[PDB]
Amino acid sequence: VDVPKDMTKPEITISDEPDTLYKRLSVLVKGHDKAVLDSYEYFAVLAAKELGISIKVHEPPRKIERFTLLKSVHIFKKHRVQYEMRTLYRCLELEHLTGSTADVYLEYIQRNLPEGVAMEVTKTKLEQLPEHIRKPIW
Amino acid sequence: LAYQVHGLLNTGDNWKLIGSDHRRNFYYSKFFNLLCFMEQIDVTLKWYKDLIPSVFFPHSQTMIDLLQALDVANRLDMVPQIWKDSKEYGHTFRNELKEEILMLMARDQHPPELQVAFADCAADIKSTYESQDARQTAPEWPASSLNYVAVLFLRAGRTQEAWKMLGLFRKHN
Amino acid sequence: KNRAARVRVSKGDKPVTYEEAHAPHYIAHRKGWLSLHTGNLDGEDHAAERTVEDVFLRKFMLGTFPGCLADQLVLKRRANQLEICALVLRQLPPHKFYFLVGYSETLLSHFYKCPVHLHLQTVPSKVVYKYI
Amino acid sequence: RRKALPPRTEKMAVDQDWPSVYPVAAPFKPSAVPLPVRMGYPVKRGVPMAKEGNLELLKIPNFLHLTPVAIKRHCEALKDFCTEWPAALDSDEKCEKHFPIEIDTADYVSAGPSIRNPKARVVTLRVKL
Amino acid sequence: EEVVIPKKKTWDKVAILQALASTVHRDSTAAPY
Amino acid sequence: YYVDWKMLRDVKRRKMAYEYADERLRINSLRKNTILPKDLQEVADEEIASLPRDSCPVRIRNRCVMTSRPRGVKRRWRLSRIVFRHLADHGQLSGVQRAMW
Amino acid sequence: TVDFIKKQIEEFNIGKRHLANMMGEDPETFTQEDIDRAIAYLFPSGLFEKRARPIMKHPEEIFPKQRAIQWGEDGRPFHFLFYTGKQSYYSLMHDTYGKLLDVEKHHNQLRAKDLLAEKTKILKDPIGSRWLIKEELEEMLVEKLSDQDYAQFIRLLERLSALPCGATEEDFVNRFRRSIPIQSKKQLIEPLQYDEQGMAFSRGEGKRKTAKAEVVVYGQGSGRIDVNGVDYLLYFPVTQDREQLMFPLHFLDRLGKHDMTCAVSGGGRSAQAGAVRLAMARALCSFVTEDEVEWMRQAGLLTADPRVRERKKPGQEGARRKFTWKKR
Ligand SMILES: [Mg+2]
Ligand SMILES: [Mg+2]
Ligand SMILES: [Mg+2]
Ligand SMILES: [Mg+2]
């Protein structure tokens, strides 16, 4: 029943600089276990739907790295022990995302990133022609 | 008046100006005691759960005030749970708190369902006396404490347990 | 006969925990990795620095808590912060546990130049999975 | 000597809000999770191990701090820090008409004490002639 | 033109966490952090 | 103390190479270009060979950082083959598992 | 361990309530499937062993079935066969043998009265009935059995089932009956598709030895195949490869009655030729009657080729060849 009344105090100063428009934002998460990435996709999709982003999710093909090492510590080169590192992929595309909405979505996504995965963002910012090109100069 | 003081404390980050630990304990000591009798026990219990033990640990006198509120509110079914929380809150071996609980449970006769609950609590209280940490210096069993425990294990269908209590009166004089 | 990270059968009187009861070929099949970080991904750099830091913590935590450590540490690296999860027996008084927690957090943070989190779970004795 | 207090699971309410218990990402605490969860390969005739003293439930990156109840509460508060995409730029064809230059940039996040990735300096500029 | 570029919103780098901190209150059964 | 005297020698060798890395690069540029006069290139060869012997990139030896095994070392983890198996078989390396296919 | 099961039952119900509370669903319909999808989300374990993943189910389903207490406080066994070691199995044998004598006695009385009102109901072939497996039987009697004991019990049922059958016996027998799933090797005929005034065109998928083939066949054209935008003769100079494409069409005597276009990628000349052959066989099932589709299977057209290149073992020259073995 007893709660801290009005414990919210953030400020959002709306300046005069025009916002940056991103044509399309691509997020590619890579990890070792599918289950973590499967849950992470659900978290990203659920948050994206609530913000109204209309995202699409696809799974790029995986790649497997293998290498071979000797077994014993002396001679015996006919017996090998192999190892394998598996990197599973998952891509989340974002379309028609403004700069202001991009900042909050990415930082909210990045802070909740699990320890066993990492991600790369490819932002396709769009803008008009340069002043020299736009303004007629021969 | 206290709610306006407490309401101000919970606004924004004003809670960081409460003071030190002993000041925080003292601030909630006086405030919680006011919550006992000035308000209905139904809302007092809600504040008891929220404030304790998350914010502060109750003092022995504060437990006495809570017991008084229950007695005035005509509710003795919560007494066994209070004793269980008392041990968790560092009041396992408080002589002042033990006497109050034993007197209240055995003050009046109760239906068998409620009497068994007091008997279970009394047995736990009896075990605490057996394993006091003051036995190294001096173990003391109060005269009142032995009497109420013996009386309690009579009406709960524990006549066999009452027989062992008869010999304690002569052993402790 | 393979001998890598195995405990040999000796009657039925030696307790074995879950980690030690599984052969190394069971990794990623029955038991996970004790440490998780980005360094060993496909196209990620900085994998040797993480490995040497990981080994040091295996030797520091084992020596900071003599005898009271239950089994292997679990190291999680999120952002630039380092989380260390441990199982500790009920050996030292709680005053000493908080001293060592405070000592470990400050020393490692100023040594690796990164924030360190130290989370402890206390158990009465070593957890036994087979034999015993 | 010192004894072990009962876990807070017993005192946990039935209808209490979960996200208040876990505000941030934290490791799986057996006392702090009311859910009885068992994992690990079972014995020949037995059941998987309990949630107390189990390392298998500690290695996993938990998602208790991102419960769907918490996700809606988290995201809704963030809706203040946003601005709408202009409605006139609905079709992708119109985007080319009003903005003929698109620029590709990359940012990389990895676990470690350093963020410097030399692959983050590339810039790809594409223009429709 | 039929397109109006909306004005950007500028906030401090720590205000984003305080927005999430508002949603989560203190826990009744939890010991101090 | 490094694990062996050989490891200590490598640290001195790497340290010396770093100090003379830029100076060697500037002089080596003259030698590797055919547009400069041959007389100047002969003088450059004398100067580049007058530098201390340890300040040579080719003399740097890649060992294991734990046991200093001169060979059988994976370049990615900078670990010997024996030590790498010791860490990987216990599950102490993320994403490393026994290969089965 | 009766009480331990009881404790697990009550806390699992309490635990289920907490899981529904945090998931924000209706606790009255928090089914087990919903529990599994909730657990798989909260604890994302990436492990290949399906049994090693986190689980939270009904303790009756998790804990193995336990034997009940066999004696009272005075030590007297409850059942009358407890001193045979295996009370459950022998009691089942005693009851089963008793039913046979009762049937034999009842049949003997019926023969005396000159009445045969029973019929043999053992034949359950259309339902696909099979007897209990030894593992399944051990989980029904809650007791371990042996191969000799299981065979004797099954043979006794056959004697019971071979006699005239009564209503009570059939219920007793049917508890030991199990139904096999549907067995059939017929393929699913893909219905013909019509698109943009195009009539009778079907699509097929084929794969053989790292080579996938996409074949769409039109039933309204002359005899020609266009692979990758070029004529098939140019694309398959080898006579054998062009024989593979003939094989499906020639088997159905429709060499010139279909116009096809193909798109095959990966592999060598023979891998693609085999892949296109497989794709046509599956794509031509739409235009052909069902009886000849069975003929197609008996000729091996519709079955994928499982032969793929093996790996190279570490320590051997090839997949099977080893280095020269010098004895001395
Ligand atoms: Mg040495
Ligand atoms: Mg030369
Ligand atoms: Mg060399
Ligand atoms: Mg060969």
PDB file of N, CA, C and O in Angstrom, chain G residues 211-270:
ATOM      1  N   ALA G 211      23.458 -31.571 -54.593  1.00  0.00           N
ATOM      2  CA  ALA G 211      22.925 -30.990 -55.822  1.00  0.00           C
ATOM      3  C   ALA G 211      21.407 -30.959 -55.717  1.00  0.00           C
ATOM      4  O   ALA G 211      20.767 -32.015 -55.710  1.00  0.00           O
ATOM      5  N   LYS G 212      20.838 -29.759 -55.644  1.00  0.00           N
ATOM      6  CA  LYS G 212      19.397 -29.575 -55.557  1.00  0.00           C
ATOM      7  C   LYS G 212      18.854 -29.189 -56.925  1.00  0.00           C
ATOM      8  O   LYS G 212      19.440 -28.351 -57.616  1.00  0.00           O
ATOM      9  N   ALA G 213      17.743 -29.807 -57.315  1.00  0.00           N
ATOM     10  CA  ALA G 213      17.127 -29.568 -58.612  1.00  0.00           C
ATOM     11  C   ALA G 213      15.696 -29.094 -58.420  1.00  0.00           C
ATOM     12  O   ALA G 213      14.935 -29.696 -57.656  1.00  0.00           O
ATOM     13  N   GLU G 214      15.339 -28.018 -59.112  1.00  0.00           N
ATOM     14  CA  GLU G 214      13.988 -27.472 -59.103  1.00  0.00           C
ATOM     15  C   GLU G 214      13.398 -27.640 -60.495  1.00  0.00           C
ATOM     16  O   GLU G 214      13.865 -27.007 -61.449  1.00  0.00           O
ATOM     17  N   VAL G 215      12.377 -28.483 -60.611  1.00  0.00           N
ATOM     18  CA  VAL G 215      11.784 -28.830 -61.897  1.00  0.00           C
ATOM     19  C   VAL G 215      10.301 -28.497 -61.864  1.00  0.00           C
ATOM     20  O   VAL G 215       9.581 -28.932 -60.959  1.00  0.00           O
ATOM     21  N   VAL G 216       9.851 -27.726 -62.850  1.00  0.00           N
ATOM     22  CA  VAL G 216       8.437 -27.467 -63.082  1.00  0.00           C
ATOM     23  C   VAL G 216       8.101 -27.962 -64.481  1.00  0.00           C
ATOM     24  O   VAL G 216       8.773 -27.595 -65.452  1.00  0.00           O
ATOM     25  N   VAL G 217       7.072 -28.797 -64.583  1.00  0.00           N
ATOM     26  CA  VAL G 217       6.726 -29.480 -65.824  1.00  0.00           C
ATOM     27  C   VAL G 217       5.354 -29.008 -66.281  1.00  0.00           C
ATOM     28  O   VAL G 217       4.394 -29.029 -65.503  1.00  0.00           O
ATOM     29  N   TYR G 218       5.267 -28.582 -67.537  1.00  0.00           N
ATOM     30  CA  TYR G 218       4.009 -28.181 -68.152  1.00  0.00           C
ATOM     31  C   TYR G 218       3.468 -29.338 -68.979  1.00  0.00           C
ATOM     32  O   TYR G 218       4.200 -29.930 -69.780  1.00  0.00           O
ATOM     33  N   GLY G 219       2.194 -29.657 -68.785  1.00  0.00           N
ATOM     34  CA  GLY G 219       1.548 -30.736 -69.500  1.00  0.00           C
ATOM     35  C   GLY G 219       0.916 -30.351 -70.819  1.00  0.00           C
ATOM     36  O   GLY G 219       0.223 -31.175 -71.423  1.00  0.00           O
ATOM     37  N   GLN G 220       1.129 -29.122 -71.286  1.00  0.00           N
ATOM     38  CA  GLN G 220       0.497 -28.624 -72.502  1.00  0.00           C
ATOM     39  C   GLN G 220       1.499 -28.307 -73.607  1.00  0.00           C
ATOM     40  O   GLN G 220       1.118 -27.704 -74.616  1.00  0.00           O
ATOM     41  N   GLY G 221       2.764 -28.694 -73.447  1.00  0.00           N
ATOM     42  CA  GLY G 221       3.796 -28.388 -74.408  1.00  0.00           C
ATOM     43  C   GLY G 221       4.372 -29.622 -75.086  1.00  0.00           C
ATOM     44  O   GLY G 221       4.036 -30.763 -74.778  1.00  0.00           O
ATOM     45  N   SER G 222       5.268 -29.357 -76.035  1.00  0.00           N
ATOM     46  CA  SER G 222       5.970 -30.411 -76.750  1.00  0.00           C
ATOM     47  C   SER G 222       7.133 -30.927 -75.905  1.00  0.00           C
ATOM     48  O   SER G 222       7.326 -30.528 -74.753  1.00  0.00           O
ATOM     49  N   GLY G 223       7.931 -31.817 -76.487  1.00  0.00           N
ATOM     50  CA  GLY G 223       9.022 -32.425 -75.753  1.00  0.00           C
ATOM     51  C   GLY G 223      10.306 -31.623 -75.789  1.00  0.00           C
ATOM     52  O   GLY G 223      11.065 -31.692 -76.761  1.00  0.00           O
ATOM     53  N   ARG G 224      10.561 -30.857 -74.730  1.00  0.00           N
ATOM     54  CA  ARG G 224      11.788 -30.083 -74.615  1.00  0.00           C
ATOM     55  C   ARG G 224      12.022 -29.751 -73.149  1.00  0.00           C
ATOM     56  O   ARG G 224      11.074 -29.569 -72.381  1.00  0.00           O
ATOM     57  N   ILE G 225      13.295 -29.680 -72.771  1.00  0.00           N
ATOM     58  CA  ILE G 225      13.705 -29.358 -71.411  1.00  0.00           C
ATOM     59  C   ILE G 225      14.698 -28.208 -71.476  1.00  0.00           C
ATOM     60  O   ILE G 225      15.665 -28.260 -72.244  1.00  0.00           O
ATOM     61  N   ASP G 226      14.460 -27.172 -70.678  1.00  0.00           N
ATOM     62  CA  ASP G 226      15.301 -25.978 -70.653  1.00  0.00           C
ATOM     63  C   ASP G 226      15.916 -25.863 -69.262  1.00  0.00           C
ATOM     64  O   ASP G 226      15.257 -25.411 -68.320  1.00  0.00           O
ATOM     65  N   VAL G 227      17.177 -26.264 -69.133  1.00  0.00           N
ATOM     66  CA  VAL G 227      17.887 -26.251 -67.859  1.00  0.00           C
ATOM     67  C   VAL G 227      18.772 -25.015 -67.813  1.00  0.00           C
ATOM     68  O   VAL G 227      19.607 -24.810 -68.702  1.00  0.00           O
ATOM     69  N   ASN G 228      18.588 -24.193 -66.780  1.00  0.00           N
ATOM     70  CA  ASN G 228      19.412 -23.006 -66.546  1.00  0.00           C
ATOM     71  C   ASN G 228      19.419 -22.065 -67.746  1.00  0.00           C
ATOM     72  O   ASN G 228      20.418 -21.397 -68.020  1.00  0.00           O
ATOM     73  N   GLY G 229      18.306 -22.001 -68.474  1.00  0.00           N
ATOM     74  CA  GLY G 229      18.199 -21.118 -69.614  1.00  0.00           C
ATOM     75  C   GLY G 229      18.832 -21.626 -70.890  1.00  0.00           C
ATOM     76  O   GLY G 229      18.834 -20.897 -71.890  1.00  0.00           O
ATOM     77  N   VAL G 230      19.369 -22.846 -70.897  1.00  0.00           N
ATOM     78  CA  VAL G 230      19.980 -23.426 -72.084  1.00  0.00           C
ATOM     79  C   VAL G 230      19.330 -24.773 -72.361  1.00  0.00           C
ATOM     80  O   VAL G 230      18.726 -25.394 -71.483  1.00  0.00           O
ATOM     81  N   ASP G 231      19.457 -25.216 -73.609  1.00  0.00           N
ATOM     82  CA  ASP G 231      18.894 -26.496 -74.012  1.00  0.00           C
ATOM     83  C   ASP G 231      19.593 -27.636 -73.278  1.00  0.00           C
ATOM     84  O   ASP G 231      20.782 -27.562 -72.960  1.00  0.00           O
ATOM     85  N   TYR G 232      18.836 -28.701 -73.006  1.00  0.00           N
ATOM     86  CA  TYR G 232      19.376 -29.798 -72.211  1.00  0.00           C
ATOM     87  C   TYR G 232      20.497 -30.528 -72.939  1.00  0.00           C
ATOM     88  O   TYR G 232      21.437 -31.010 -72.296  1.00  0.00           O
ATOM     89  N   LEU G 233      20.420 -30.622 -74.269  1.00  0.00           N
ATOM     90  CA  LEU G 233      21.478 -31.290 -75.019  1.00  0.00           C
ATOM     91  C   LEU G 233      22.807 -30.564 -74.861  1.00  0.00           C
ATOM     92  O   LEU G 233      23.853 -31.200 -74.678  1.00  0.00           O
ATOM     93  N   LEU G 234      22.790 -29.233 -74.931  1.00  0.00           N
ATOM     94  CA  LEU G 234      24.015 -28.472 -74.721  1.00  0.00           C
ATOM     95  C   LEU G 234      24.504 -28.594 -73.284  1.00  0.00           C
ATOM     96  O   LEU G 234      25.713 -28.672 -73.038  1.00  0.00           O
ATOM     97  N   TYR G 235      23.581 -28.606 -72.320  1.00  0.00           N
ATOM     98  CA  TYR G 235      23.966 -28.637 -70.916  1.00  0.00           C
ATOM     99  C   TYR G 235      24.434 -30.011 -70.458  1.00  0.00           C
ATOM    100  O   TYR G 235      25.184 -30.097 -69.479  1.00  0.00           O
ATOM    101  N   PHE G 236      24.023 -31.079 -71.137  1.00  0.00           N
ATOM    102  CA  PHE G 236      24.399 -32.446 -70.780  1.00  0.00           C
ATOM    103  C   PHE G 236      25.011 -33.120 -72.000  1.00  0.00           C
ATOM    104  O   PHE G 236      24.358 -33.933 -72.668  1.00  0.00           O
ATOM    105  N   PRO G 237      26.265 -32.798 -72.327  1.00  0.00           N
ATOM    106  CA  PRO G 237      26.909 -33.458 -73.474  1.00  0.00           C
ATOM    107  C   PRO G 237      27.043 -34.961 -73.312  1.00  0.00           C
ATOM    108  O   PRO G 237      27.020 -35.688 -74.313  1.00  0.00           O
ATOM    109  N   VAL G 238      27.184 -35.448 -72.080  1.00  0.00           N
ATOM    110  CA  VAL G 238      27.385 -36.873 -71.849  1.00  0.00           C
ATOM    111  C   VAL G 238      26.104 -37.627 -72.174  1.00  0.00           C
ATOM    112  O   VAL G 238      25.006 -37.230 -71.760  1.00  0.00           O
ATOM    113  N   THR G 239      26.238 -38.723 -72.924  1.00  0.00           N
ATOM    114  CA  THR G 239      25.073 -39.525 -73.283  1.00  0.00           C
ATOM    115  C   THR G 239      24.413 -40.124 -72.049  1.00  0.00           C
ATOM    116  O   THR G 239      23.182 -40.199 -71.969  1.00  0.00           O
ATOM    117  N   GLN G 240      25.216 -40.556 -71.074  1.00  0.00           N
ATOM    118  CA  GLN G 240      24.657 -41.167 -69.871  1.00  0.00           C
ATOM    119  C   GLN G 240      23.792 -40.181 -69.097  1.00  0.00           C
ATOM    120  O   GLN G 240      22.729 -40.548 -68.584  1.00  0.00           O
ATOM    121  N   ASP G 241      24.234 -38.925 -68.990  1.00  0.00           N
ATOM    122  CA  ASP G 241      23.455 -37.931 -68.258  1.00  0.00           C
ATOM    123  C   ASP G 241      22.107 -37.685 -68.921  1.00  0.00           C
ATOM    124  O   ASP G 241      21.083 -37.579 -68.236  1.00  0.00           O
ATOM    125  N   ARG G 242      22.082 -37.591 -70.251  1.00  0.00           N
ATOM    126  CA  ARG G 242      20.810 -37.439 -70.948  1.00  0.00           C
ATOM    127  C   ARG G 242      19.965 -38.703 -70.881  1.00  0.00           C
ATOM    128  O   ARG G 242      18.749 -38.630 -71.081  1.00  0.00           O
ATOM    129  N   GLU G 243      20.579 -39.857 -70.610  1.00  0.00           N
ATOM    130  CA  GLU G 243      19.799 -41.065 -70.374  1.00  0.00           C
ATOM    131  C   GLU G 243      19.065 -41.004 -69.041  1.00  0.00           C
ATOM    132  O   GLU G 243      17.968 -41.557 -68.914  1.00  0.00           O
ATOM    133  N   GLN G 244      19.658 -40.350 -68.040  1.00  0.00           N
ATOM    134  CA  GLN G 244      18.994 -40.222 -66.747  1.00  0.00           C
ATOM    135  C   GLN G 244      17.705 -39.419 -66.865  1.00  0.00           C
ATOM    136  O   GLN G 244      16.686 -39.777 -66.266  1.00  0.00           O
ATOM    137  N   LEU G 245      17.730 -38.328 -67.636  1.00  0.00           N
ATOM    138  CA  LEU G 245      16.519 -37.537 -67.827  1.00  0.00           C
ATOM    139  C   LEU G 245      15.460 -38.310 -68.600  1.00  0.00           C
ATOM    140  O   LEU G 245      14.262 -38.104 -68.381  1.00  0.00           O
ATOM    141  N   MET G 246      15.878 -39.187 -69.513  1.00  0.00           N
ATOM    142  CA  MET G 246      14.919 -39.989 -70.263  1.00  0.00           C
ATOM    143  C   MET G 246      14.200 -40.983 -69.360  1.00  0.00           C
ATOM    144  O   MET G 246      13.011 -41.261 -69.557  1.00  0.00           O
ATOM    145  N   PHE G 247      14.900 -41.508 -68.355  1.00  0.00           N
ATOM    146  CA  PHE G 247      14.396 -42.627 -67.559  1.00  0.00           C
ATOM    147  C   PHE G 247      13.012 -42.397 -66.958  1.00  0.00           C
ATOM    148  O   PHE G 247      12.173 -43.308 -67.050  1.00  0.00           O
ATOM    149  N   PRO G 248      12.697 -41.245 -66.338  1.00  0.00           N
ATOM    150  CA  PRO G 248      11.325 -41.055 -65.844  1.00  0.00           C
ATOM    151  C   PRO G 248      10.304 -40.974 -66.968  1.00  0.00           C
ATOM    152  O   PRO G 248       9.268 -41.644 -66.920  1.00  0.00           O
ATOM    153  N   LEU G 249      10.587 -40.156 -67.985  1.00  0.00           N
ATOM    154  CA  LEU G 249       9.635 -39.977 -69.077  1.00  0.00           C
ATOM    155  C   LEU G 249       9.435 -41.265 -69.865  1.00  0.00           C
ATOM    156  O   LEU G 249       8.303 -41.606 -70.227  1.00  0.00           O
ATOM    157  N   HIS G 250      10.519 -41.992 -70.145  1.00  0.00           N
ATOM    158  CA  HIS G 250      10.395 -43.215 -70.929  1.00  0.00           C
ATOM    159  C   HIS G 250       9.613 -44.288 -70.185  1.00  0.00           C
ATOM    160  O   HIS G 250       8.940 -45.111 -70.815  1.00  0.00           O
ATOM    161  N   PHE G 251       9.694 -44.302 -68.854  1.00  0.00           N
ATOM    162  CA  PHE G 251       8.955 -45.296 -68.084  1.00  0.00           C
ATOM    163  C   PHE G 251       7.450 -45.090 -68.203  1.00  0.00           C
ATOM    164  O   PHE G 251       6.686 -46.060 -68.134  1.00  0.00           O
ATOM    165  N   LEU G 252       7.009 -43.847 -68.384  1.00  0.00           N
ATOM    166  CA  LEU G 252       5.596 -43.521 -68.503  1.00  0.00           C
ATOM    167  C   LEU G 252       5.137 -43.361 -69.946  1.00  0.00           C
ATOM    168  O   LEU G 252       3.961 -43.059 -70.174  1.00  0.00           O
ATOM    169  N   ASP G 253       6.031 -43.554 -70.919  1.00  0.00           N
ATOM    170  CA  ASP G 253       5.707 -43.408 -72.340  1.00  0.00           C
ATOM    171  C   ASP G 253       5.137 -42.025 -72.645  1.00  0.00           C
ATOM    172  O   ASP G 253       4.150 -41.885 -73.369  1.00  0.00           O
ATOM    173  N   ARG G 254       5.761 -40.994 -72.085  1.00  0.00           N
ATOM    174  CA  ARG G 254       5.370 -39.606 -72.308  1.00  0.00           C
ATOM    175  C   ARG G 254       6.598 -38.753 -72.593  1.00  0.00           C
ATOM    176  O   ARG G 254       6.814 -37.700 -71.989  1.00  0.00           O
ATOM    177  N   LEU G 255       7.431 -39.218 -73.527  1.00  0.00           N
ATOM    178  CA  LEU G 255       8.674 -38.518 -73.837  1.00  0.00           C
ATOM    179  C   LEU G 255       8.411 -37.134 -74.421  1.00  0.00           C
ATOM    180  O   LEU G 255       9.052 -36.152 -74.030  1.00  0.00           O
ATOM    181  N   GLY G 256       7.475 -37.034 -75.364  1.00  0.00           N
ATOM    182  CA  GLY G 256       7.209 -35.784 -76.048  1.00  0.00           C
ATOM    183  C   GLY G 256       5.952 -35.052 -75.642  1.00  0.00           C
ATOM    184  O   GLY G 256       5.541 -34.124 -76.353  1.00  0.00           O
ATOM    185  N   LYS G 257       5.317 -35.422 -74.533  1.00  0.00           N
ATOM    186  CA  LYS G 257       4.043 -34.842 -74.135  1.00  0.00           C
ATOM    187  C   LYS G 257       4.175 -33.806 -73.027  1.00  0.00           C
ATOM    188  O   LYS G 257       3.155 -33.359 -72.494  1.00  0.00           O
ATOM    189  N   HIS G 258       5.394 -33.413 -72.663  1.00  0.00           N
ATOM    190  CA  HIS G 258       5.587 -32.480 -71.563  1.00  0.00           C
ATOM    191  C   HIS G 258       6.706 -31.500 -71.876  1.00  0.00           C
ATOM    192  O   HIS G 258       7.752 -31.886 -72.403  1.00  0.00           O
ATOM    193  N   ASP G 259       6.479 -30.236 -71.532  1.00  0.00           N
ATOM    194  CA  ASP G 259       7.470 -29.178 -71.661  1.00  0.00           C
ATOM    195  C   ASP G 259       7.919 -28.768 -70.266  1.00  0.00           C
ATOM    196  O   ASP G 259       7.086 -28.462 -69.408  1.00  0.00           O
ATOM    197  N   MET G 260       9.231 -28.764 -70.041  1.00  0.00           N
ATOM    198  CA  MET G 260       9.787 -28.554 -68.714  1.00  0.00           C
ATOM    199  C   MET G 260      10.865 -27.482 -68.745  1.00  0.00           C
ATOM    200  O   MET G 260      11.534 -27.275 -69.761  1.00  0.00           O
ATOM    201  N   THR G 261      11.020 -26.799 -67.614  1.00  0.00           N
ATOM    202  CA  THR G 261      12.149 -25.915 -67.368  1.00  0.00           C
ATOM    203  C   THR G 261      12.709 -26.226 -65.989  1.00  0.00           C
ATOM    204  O   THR G 261      11.954 -26.414 -65.032  1.00  0.00           O
ATOM    205  N   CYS G 262      14.034 -26.286 -65.892  1.00  0.00           N
ATOM    206  CA  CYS G 262      14.698 -26.751 -64.685  1.00  0.00           C
ATOM    207  C   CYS G 262      15.710 -25.719 -64.210  1.00  0.00           C
ATOM    208  O   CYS G 262      16.147 -24.847 -64.965  1.00  0.00           O
ATOM    209  N   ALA G 263      16.073 -25.830 -62.932  1.00  0.00           N
ATOM    210  CA  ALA G 263      17.092 -24.967 -62.338  1.00  0.00           C
ATOM    211  C   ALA G 263      17.818 -25.794 -61.281  1.00  0.00           C
ATOM    212  O   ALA G 263      17.290 -26.006 -60.186  1.00  0.00           O
ATOM    213  N   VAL G 264      19.020 -26.256 -61.614  1.00  0.00           N
ATOM    214  CA  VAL G 264      19.804 -27.125 -60.745  1.00  0.00           C
ATOM    215  C   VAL G 264      21.138 -26.451 -60.451  1.00  0.00           C
ATOM    216  O   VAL G 264      21.756 -25.860 -61.344  1.00  0.00           O
ATOM    217  N   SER G 265      21.572 -26.527 -59.194  1.00  0.00           N
ATOM    218  CA  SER G 265      22.801 -25.888 -58.751  1.00  0.00           C
ATOM    219  C   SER G 265      23.615 -26.847 -57.897  1.00  0.00           C
ATOM    220  O   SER G 265      23.067 -27.700 -57.195  1.00  0.00           O
ATOM    221  N   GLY G 266      24.937 -26.700 -57.968  1.00  0.00           N
ATOM    222  CA  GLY G 266      25.839 -27.482 -57.146  1.00  0.00           C
ATOM    223  C   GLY G 266      26.121 -28.869 -57.685  1.00  0.00           C
ATOM    224  O   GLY G 266      25.285 -29.454 -58.380  1.00  0.00           O
ATOM    225  N   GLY G 267      27.298 -29.405 -57.370  1.00  0.00           N
ATOM    226  CA  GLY G 267      27.661 -30.746 -57.783  1.00  0.00           C
ATOM    227  C   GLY G 267      28.233 -30.802 -59.184  1.00  0.00           C
ATOM    228  O   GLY G 267      28.353 -29.804 -59.899  1.00  0.00           O
ATOM    229  N   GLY G 268      28.596 -32.020 -59.583  1.00  0.00           N
ATOM    230  CA  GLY G 268      29.147 -32.272 -60.895  1.00  0.00           C
ATOM    231  C   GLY G 268      28.068 -32.556 -61.923  1.00  0.00           C
ATOM    232  O   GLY G 268      26.879 -32.319 -61.709  1.00  0.00           O
ATOM    233  N   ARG G 269      28.508 -33.074 -63.072  1.00  0.00           N
ATOM    234  CA  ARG G 269      27.570 -33.380 -64.146  1.00  0.00           C
ATOM    235  C   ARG G 269      26.610 -34.496 -63.747  1.00  0.00           C
ATOM    236  O   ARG G 269      25.410 -34.420 -64.036  1.00  0.00           O
ATOM    237  N   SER G 270      27.113 -35.538 -63.080  1.00  0.00           N
ATOM    238  CA  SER G 270      26.261 -36.664 -62.717  1.00  0.00           C
ATOM    239  C   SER G 270      25.372 -36.338 -61.526  1.00  0.00           C
ATOM    240  O   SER G 270      24.237 -36.818 -61.449  1.00  0.00           O
TER     241      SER G 270
END
